[PDB]
Amino acid sequence: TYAVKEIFYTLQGEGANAGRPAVFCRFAGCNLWSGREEDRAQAVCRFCDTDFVGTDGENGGKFKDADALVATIAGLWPAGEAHRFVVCTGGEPMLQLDQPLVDALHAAGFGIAIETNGSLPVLESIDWICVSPKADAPLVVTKGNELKVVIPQDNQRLADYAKLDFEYFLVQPMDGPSRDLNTKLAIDWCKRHPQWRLSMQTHKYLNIP
Amino acid sequence: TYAVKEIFYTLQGEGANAGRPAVFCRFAGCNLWSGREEDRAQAVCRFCDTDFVGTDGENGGKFKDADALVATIAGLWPAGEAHRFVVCTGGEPMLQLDQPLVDALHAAGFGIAIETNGSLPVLESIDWICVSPKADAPLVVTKGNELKVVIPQDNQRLADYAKLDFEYFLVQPMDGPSRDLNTKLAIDWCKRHPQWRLSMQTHKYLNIP
Ligand SMILES: C[S@@+](CC[C@H](N)C(=O)[O-])C[C@H]1O[C@@H](n2cnc3c(N)ncnc32)[C@H](O)[C@@H]1O
Numbered sequence: 082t083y084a085v086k087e088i089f090y091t092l093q094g095e096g097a098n099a100g101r102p103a104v105f106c107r108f109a110g111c112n113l114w115s116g117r118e119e120d121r122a123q124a125v126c127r128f129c130d131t132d133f134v135g136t137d138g139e140n141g142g143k144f145k146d147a148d149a150l151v152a153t154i155a156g157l158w159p160a161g162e163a164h165r166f167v168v169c170t171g172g173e174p175m176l177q178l179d180q181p182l183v184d185a186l187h188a189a190g191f192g193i194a195i196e197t198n199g200s201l202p203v204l205e206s207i208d209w210i211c212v213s214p215k216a217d218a219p220l221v222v223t224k225g226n227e228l229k230v231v232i233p234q235d236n237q238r239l240a241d242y243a244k245l246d247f248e249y250f251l252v253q254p255m256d257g258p259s260r261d262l263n264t265k266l267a268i269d270w271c272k273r274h275p276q277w278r279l280s281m282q283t284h285k286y287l288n289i290p
Numbered sequence: 291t292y293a294v295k296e297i298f299y300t301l302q303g304e305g306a307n308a309g310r311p312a313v314f315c316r317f318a319g320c321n322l323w324s325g326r327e328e329d330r331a332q333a334v335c336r337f338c339d340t341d342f343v344g345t346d347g348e349n350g351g352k353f354k355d356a357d358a359l360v361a362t363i364a365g366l367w368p369a370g371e372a373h374r375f376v377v378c379t380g381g382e383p384m385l386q387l388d389q390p391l392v393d394a395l396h397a398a399g400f401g402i403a404i405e406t407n408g409s410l411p412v413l414e415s416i417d418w419i420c421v422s423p424k425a426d427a428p429l430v431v432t433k434g435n436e437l438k439v440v441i442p443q444d445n446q447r448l449a450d451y452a453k454l455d456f457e458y459f460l461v462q463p464m465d466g467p468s469r470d471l472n473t474k475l476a477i478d479w480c481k482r483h484p485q486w487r488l489s490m491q492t493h494k495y496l497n498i499p
Pocket residue numbers: 111128129130131170171172173174196197198199212213229231253254255256257282
């Protein structure tokens with residue numbers, strides 16, 4: 082059984098796949114924050130820009146099995162078009178994403194991406210693994226396709242991340258009252274340490290979901 | 291001998307490599323437009339957003355040979371950092387980019403990207419080939435890494451471009467008085483035909499060179 086906040090079709094706004102059409106499957110619930118504003122100030126992850134509480138968003142609900150969920154995800158794809166691509170996110174998707182859902186998505190022709198905080202083991206049959214490490218959480222996922230680090234966070238050991246086994250190393254400016262400041266910081270970081278590339282949250286500039 | 295408008299260090303704003311630190315080598319001169327405003331209305335390519343006239347920009351000039359040009363390019367890279375990457379553009383870079391410059395850049399440890407209008411044969415030893423076809427010009431480069439089509443253009447057979455031999459197919463909104471309009475058209479195009487992905491001119495949103 083899957084608790085899903087929302088499912089929607091848009092362009093991936095972030096990371097190496099920015100600009101790519103994708104169905105987003107946003108799972109409800111996270112292991113680093115309750116999602117309640119009352120808890121934010123004491124949480125492990127305190128800067129979250131997302132509503133992942135409950136199953137009341139667009140196409141959200143409790144799905145009784147993988148087939149039900151895949152049917153809804155598939156239904157959002159343009160008729161007759163291939164290149165099916167789904168981004169599993171949340172919330173922390175690895176609280177719920179399992180091999181049966183991965184297998185059912187694959188059998189429906191989807192390539193699968195995940196957005197994960199890296200504090201939980203990931204299924205390696207997932208096609209595109211994006212890990213976004215939180216400075217005060219364990220990082221147990223040390224290989225993947227892209228490591229997308231939100232900066233700045235206190236306690237961060239940023240240069241150390243570049244030692245890990247990823248294809249791409251990205252910094253993403255932390256949105257909030259200092260987004261423009263953080264964007265300049267991020268640009269400067271990449272220019273000084275060009276192993277790193279910039280990940281903009283482009284959907285916020287394009288004003289799309 | 292090379293006529294170079296400007297050379298500068300920044301992040302690639304466009305295409306699949308958007309966000310990546312790069313030295314931009316902007317060659318002076320193009321074969322589809324003189325670069326003069328009085329000629330724009332009659333040019334083969336009429337929507338250009340770039341100044342490629344003369345050799346008077348930052349680090350711009352007339353370079354004696356490949357070694358002199360590579361020296362200036364390499365000089366802009368952060369000392370002791372690898373991942374060297376140069377984007378050859380202009381102007382139309384294939385008017386000037388030759389094998390000795392490519393070989394010299396490679397010997398200096400640079401990966402080489404090109405931004406080309408596709409009307410001239412390209413050097414296939416270039417590491418990253420981005421082709422941006424102009425609807426009223428011939429297209430003689432029909433394979434490469436990314437095909438980044440600026441939209442809308444009159445006379446365009448946009449869907450048909452997808453039959454060419456590229457890894458990525460992108461649409462980029464035409465900047466000018468209708469940028470926001472064209473951005474909406476481009477997003478819609480990708481969502482309708484998800485083989486295509488959106489290429490934003492992110493440097494214009496970030497306000498960086
Ligand atoms: C909402 S999280 C959900 C996926 C997973 N829980 C994670 O943290 O990777 C999706 C992405 O948004 C990023 N993000 C969250 N809050 C952000 C903020 N205020 N500014 C920028 N990126 C943010 C996260 O780091 C992550 O890369």
